Amino acid sequence: DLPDVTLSLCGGLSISKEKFMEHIITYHEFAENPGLIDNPNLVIRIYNRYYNWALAAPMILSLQVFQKSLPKATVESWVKDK
Amino acid sequence: DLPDVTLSLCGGLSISKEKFMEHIITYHEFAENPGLIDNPNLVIRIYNRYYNWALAAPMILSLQVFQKSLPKATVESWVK
Ligand SMILES: [Ca+2]
Ligand SMILES: [Ca+2]
């Protein structure tokens, strides 16, 4: 089954798990303010790691479009680039 | 039954079915260049409509995180 994705406004990339779950974004919060997608404090939990939106967006998009993760070698080069 | 999402480098968002299908991005093409997400010609097909990456990003994110589409009033106010 496909990986879970979790959103939190915890910041800190510029991260403990207590920090992450204290600021988790609900559906209702996102549905009332989609502009949070540009919030630099937005953190994405996927693959047991923490990413900002600019690093997680391809992985999110690949899962929604092809229902398949980006290859592990692909994720490494996308991240070591940035 | 969540909405289908299709990618295409068809551009021209400033669209024919023919031009969209001709430049549909496969998994291998995206896996070889994730930078396509910032390509100005990237077109997203969802809800029988065409969006660039900027408008389509929250819709796809809410489908991935909450497995539920954004509210129609929200998508409409977000796309305004
Ligand atoms: Ca919250
Ligand atoms: Ca193609």
Residue numbers in the entry:
A (entry chain B): 462 to 475, 480 to 547
B (entry chain A): 462 to 475, 480 to 545
Copy the relevant paper text.
Lipins are magnesium-dependent phosphatidic acid phosphatases (PAPs) that catalyze the dephosphorylation of the membrane lipid phosphatidic acid (PA) to produce diacylglycerol (DAG). Our principal findings are that the M-Lip domain is a new protein fold that forms a dimer, binds membranes, and can affect lipin PAP activity, oligomerization, subcellular localization, and adipogenesis. Phospholipid synthesis and fat storage as triglycerides are regulated by lipin phosphatidic acid phosphatases (PAPs), whose enzymatic PAP function requires association with cellular membranes.
We also determined the structure of the mouse lipin 2 M-Lipxtal domain to 2.5 Å resolution. The M-Lip domain of mouse lipin 1 and lipin 2 formed a symmetric or near symmetric dimer in all three crystal forms with a root mean square deviation for all atoms ranging between 0.36–0.77 Å. The observation of near identical dimers in three different crystal structures strongly suggested the native quaternary structure of the M-Lip domain as dimeric. Notably, the residues involved in dimerization were highly conserved among human and mouse lipin 1, lipin 2, and lipin 3 paralogs. Lastly, our data suggest that the conserved dimer interface of the M-Lip may contribute to both homo and hetero-dimerization of mammalian lipins.
